[PDB]
Amino acid sequence: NSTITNVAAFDTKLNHLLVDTITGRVFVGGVNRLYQLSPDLELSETVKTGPQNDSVECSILDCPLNAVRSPTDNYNKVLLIDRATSRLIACGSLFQGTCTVRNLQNVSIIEHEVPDAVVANDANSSTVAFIAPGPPQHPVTNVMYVGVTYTNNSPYRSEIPAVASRSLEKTKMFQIASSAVTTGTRTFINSYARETYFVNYVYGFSSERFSYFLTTQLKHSHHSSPKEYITKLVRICQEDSNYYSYTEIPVECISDAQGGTKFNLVQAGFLGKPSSDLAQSLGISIQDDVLFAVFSKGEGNTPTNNSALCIYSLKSIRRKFMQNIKSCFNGSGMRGLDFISPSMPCVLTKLQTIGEDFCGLDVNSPLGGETPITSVPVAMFNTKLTSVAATSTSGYTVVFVGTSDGFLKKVVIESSSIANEYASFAVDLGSEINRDMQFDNQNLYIYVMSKTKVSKVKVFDCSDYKTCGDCLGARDPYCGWCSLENKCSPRSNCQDDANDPLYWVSYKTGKC
Amino acid sequence: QTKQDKVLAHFIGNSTDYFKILDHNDEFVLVGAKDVIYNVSLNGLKEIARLEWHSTDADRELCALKGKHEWDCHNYLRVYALRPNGEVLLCGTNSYKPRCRHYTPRYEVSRDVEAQGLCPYSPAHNSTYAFADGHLYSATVADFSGGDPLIYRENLRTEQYDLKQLNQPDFVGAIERNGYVLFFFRELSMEVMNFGKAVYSRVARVCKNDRGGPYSHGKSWTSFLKARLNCSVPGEFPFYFDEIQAISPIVESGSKSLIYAVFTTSVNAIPGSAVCAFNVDDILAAFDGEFKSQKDSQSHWLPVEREQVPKPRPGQCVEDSRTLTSIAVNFIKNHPLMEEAVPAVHGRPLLTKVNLHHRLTAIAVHPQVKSLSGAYYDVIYSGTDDGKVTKFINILSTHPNSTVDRLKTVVISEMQVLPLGTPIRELVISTSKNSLVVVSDGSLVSVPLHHCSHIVDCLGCLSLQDPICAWDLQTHECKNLATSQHKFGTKTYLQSLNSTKKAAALLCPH
Ligand SMILES: *[C@@H]1O[C@H](CO)[C@@H](O[C@@H]2O[C@H](CO)[C@@H](O[C@@H]3O[C@H](CO[C@H]4O[C@H](CO)[C@@H](O)[C@H](O)[C@@H]4O)[C@@H](O)[C@H](O[C@H]4O[C@H](CO)[C@@H](O)[C@H](O)[C@@H]4O)[C@@H]3O)[C@H](O)[C@H]2NC(C)=O)[C@H](O)[C@H]1NC(C)=O
Ligand SMILES: *[C@@H]1O[C@H](CO)[C@@H](O[C@@H]2O[C@H](CO)[C@@H](O[C@@H]3O[C@H](CO[C@H]4O[C@H](CO)[C@@H](O)[C@H](O)[C@@H]4O)[C@@H](O)[C@H](O[C@H]4O[C@H](CO)[C@@H](O)[C@H](O)[C@@H]4O)[C@@H]3O)[C@H](O)[C@H]2NC(C)=O)[C@H](O)[C@H]1NC(C)=O
Ligand SMILES: *[C@@H]1O[C@H](CO)[C@@H](O)[C@H](O)[C@H]1NC(C)=O
Ligand SMILES: *[C@@H]1O[C@H](CO)[C@@H](O)[C@H](O)[C@H]1NC(C)=O
Ligand SMILES: *[C@@H]1O[C@H](CO)[C@@H](O)[C@H](O)[C@H]1NC(C)=O
Ligand SMILES: *[C@@H]1O[C@H](CO)[C@@H](O)[C@H](O)[C@H]1NC(C)=O
């Protein structure tokens, strides 16, 4: 195939994938393995991370009686790059979720080994980690925001928070960033809900002085109601060194079809920028952020083959958080988040200037919003969608969507209402496409990772359209047709030397 | 309805402030109030010194901003302690932003710092503390919203939001004893598998040489244990008083150390009050029995299986608690409640007031008043929520009407001290000045501890049945036996306590 450029097949099962934004090097974290590659998927270094002797009942320092360490696999759970200090962060499942700090030029080198329990020690329990501004100092130092699911397999697991900010200082590596006697940059799930109410962390991102987590979880903690799974959005102010601003609102992607259809289970997320046309529909500037996410209707907690693509602007996300916060501080309703501590009523407050930047106070502090942010999907699909990525190199936004069956689909989004597929092909047939799907630095190639392979896929190829009815017929937003030369190519490739403005024509603006 | 008492002195402030005895000697008492703290002489309830500390206008605008009222946004002084160097530790609520200061000598501010977990936010009588061996043990809330109760010392706290250790408690007192610190409070019941918003009263304990567990446990207690207090009426038809209201300091009644407590019934129940007393040895002995099992999905099991208790029993004070095992510290954090309930002295309440209009609210005891026969009786003072003080003793008549010993309550007097509606918050006894200081929200009133001098009639002196007043027959004066000297073989003095009150009067001739 000519659309796929490079293919790298690995020996183990792959877990994560990131691209260095300035050097374009590729880092792949997998089961018992850890690989570094060049921008063309040429292997540079490979690191054996397992297996090692380990039991879930034991920590590194002590192993209780009648328990024995046995060789177990080391699933990679976190893969991150620090920009200020050139060093790679990789966390494994062994030893209660340990992180190592490796050199960026050569991942084989270990620079710092920490013993702190940071990440889920399960093979399937989620873990989401991104680096963004935070305390202790005012936002000149970055921290690691981590969200971990309670694996429920060890007594040492209670020690690990569910959401927390963690320091990147050499002296205090991976410790909670700011902690005091009664408060800190940390949220635990209470002893009564910890073993029953689990939280699945899907995606994490930072936008406009706030840290975000996209989660799936049970709507209710008490057993008074039947089990319903919802998608939530966890937020914290980055200046906040107390998590006074820990707040959640639910996320609904609702459809007209079959009466009421709720795509309750989110599968993957991607934060990106809109196009000229799309920014007008959402009522935002082109420099503003848009959240792209793929939701799947789920039988219980299991996603079905009935997915949908939903977009959310962060102006409406911030205005929905503000809507839930304003309402609590006006005394209406219950604070929520009964699975942190018993839910007490919202207090009436004299607060007069709660805005989009509200950063939290002592009162109504851990707030659980009930008013959801709602969106109607621009596209629906007959397969389970497992990844999402968005680029606006062309004048239009194109969303790249990965299939659990191994297919890549491209959707062009012209409005909050109108969008449709213009391409669809298999990258690794029979192999679910991983959630970590990232572009090249120029957004010209996209890295698609399946179970055991990584494929460098070209974002557009207009040269393979010989005749012109094929160029405009492909309905590719990247492809137009120069009148003079017989080449299909984008606008920049044609020469406006021709007198007629119909030198370059799009697939919907004219006829060839 | 009720005779008013002979008020000796008074010390009045507004009703808006909220007095809290923060230290008491027989000569002086310290009173924390709305924006000041008073040093008051017990000689005439006269102010001797004052230390004013007002919340800044910005700090108290923040309080009203977060949904509070004017009367809540003040700096209610609520913690006092004289440090071993002459320094003065003084903390206040500071409009729901508690602060602590270090005054050094008059006084001058030497340190100011946050006090979350060291000092309540609200002026309510919800909290307590004990400055034991140069360290403040605090039992309060650490959050503005009041949903994070804890027991905090320097670098050690209970588990945040752990309801098996503390479930919405109201602390009533704290005692230092024998290398432990005891905390008295009422709590929500999650102990029983079928709990339904019931309130039970606990006594808790922490070792003073606790230094936290190993590794991550280094900031939490390795010795926190609690037991239920049993203040019930026994028999075929039990009657429980489950909400503890006030305790007393440890009282040395002969060879027994006792703690006296006031209990009441829950709301939407048969209204009633009681006074109970618990031996200090019975309190500590309960922490040596079985632990109560945690809640599971089956909920059909005995207390903790005794095969799960580690070889060094949890709760004992080890020299370095940082050497314990993760198994041991996690155990005591999952089994902080003892199985056995602390029994009461005589196995029943010493006084009961059921279905009356008023409730008992405070307690104080004058121990070991030697009667005319040479018997020692503790004299018990209990104040009501409508401003009365009840005085009484207990006599354990051996086989008076049955083979089982029968305990009887001898009520000496129940007089009105404060105006008809005002709740008595605390009581402080000065055995030296023969004065009883009654504490309300905005006043202190002193009354006579013993009324021997006031009465002049023979019938009154014997009907009073005070163990310290007896009628002389050479002198017509009803005399105080503390200053008098009987000789066991003289028919001079006359006193009747075991009989009825009318029977005591018949002993008076003519
Ligand atoms: C409420 O207000 C009352 C009255 O203002 C305070 O009571 C006074 O408290 C001060 C401070 O403790 C007392 O001063 C101390 O007196 C001690 C005893 O003094 C008597 O005995 C000596 C001989 O032993 C006589 O010379 C003297 O005239 C008295 O008859 C002294 O021993 C103390 O000195 C020691 O301590 C200081 C401080 O560390 C050291 O610097 C000295 O070097 C020395 O070691 C001290 O002088 C005063 O006597 C009290 N007055 C009364 C009438 O009781 C209360 O303290 C206050 N409430 C609270 C809670 O403080
Ligand atoms: C607060 O404090 C009060 C008083 O201190 C407690 O009341 C006691 O409660 C216990 C149990 O709740 C009572 O003890 C029970 O006695 C029952 C019958 O006793 C009669 O029969 C025995 C037979 O030898 C006689 O000796 C005795 O004198 C009585 O005539 C028993 O049926 C109870 O069950 C246990 O023993 C039997 C027999 O061995 C077993 O079959 C059972 O399975 C079980 O093991 C128990 O022995 C006691 O009598 C009460 N005392 C009083 C004065 O009322 C409260 O319980 C306490 N509250 C709390 C919360 O702690
Ligand atoms: C622990 O590792 C050793 C290798 O040093 C291995 O031989 C042994 O089998 C492991 N333990 C168990 C219980 O398998
Ligand atoms: C990278 O690190 C490994 C292990 O220390 C070493 O063998 C190798 O020589 C280093 N450099 C390169 C270019 O591989
Ligand atoms: C983890 O997930 C994989 C794929 O869904 C599955 O094959 C495996 O059995 C799971 N492991 C556990 C312990 O559930
Ligand atoms: C969903 O589609 C994928 C194709 O990638 C397939 O593996 C899976 O079996 C399908 N499930 C159902 C229920 O159709």
Author numbering:
A (entry chain A): 62 to 573
B (entry chain B): 43 to 147, 165 to 569
Article, verbatim:
We next determined crystal structures of the PlexA1‐4‐Sema1b1‐2 complex from two different crystal forms (1:1 complex and 2:2 complex) at 3.0 and 4.8 Å resolution. The 1:1 complex crystal lattice contains one PlexA1‐4 monomer and one Sema1b1‐2 monomer per asymmetric unit. The crystal packing provides no Sema1b1‐2 dimerisation resembling that of the generic homodimeric architecture. The Sema1b1‐2 bound in the 1:1 complex with PlexA1‐4 is very similar to the unbound Sema1b1‐2 with the Cα rmsd of 0.81 Å indicating no large conformational changes upon complex formation. Only small differences in loop orientations at the ligand–receptor interface are apparent. The PlexA1‐4 structure in the 1:1 complex contains a sema domain composed of a seven‐bladed β‐propeller fold, which is followed by a PSI domain; however, we were not able to locate the IPT1‐PSI2 domain segment. The sema domain of PlexA is most similar to mouse PlxnA2 with an rmsd of 1.43 Å over 424 matched Cα positions. In the 1:1 complex crystal structure, PlexA1‐4 and Sema1b1‐2 interact through their sema domains in a head‐to‐head orientation similar to the generic architecture shared by all reported structures of semaphorin–plexin complexes (Janssen et al, 2010; Liu et al, 2010; Nogi et al, 2010). The PlexA1‐4‐Sema1b1‐2 interface buries a total solvent‐accessible area of 1,837 Å2. This extensive interface is composed of a mixture of hydrophobic and hydrophilic interactions similar to that of PlxnA2‐Sema6A.
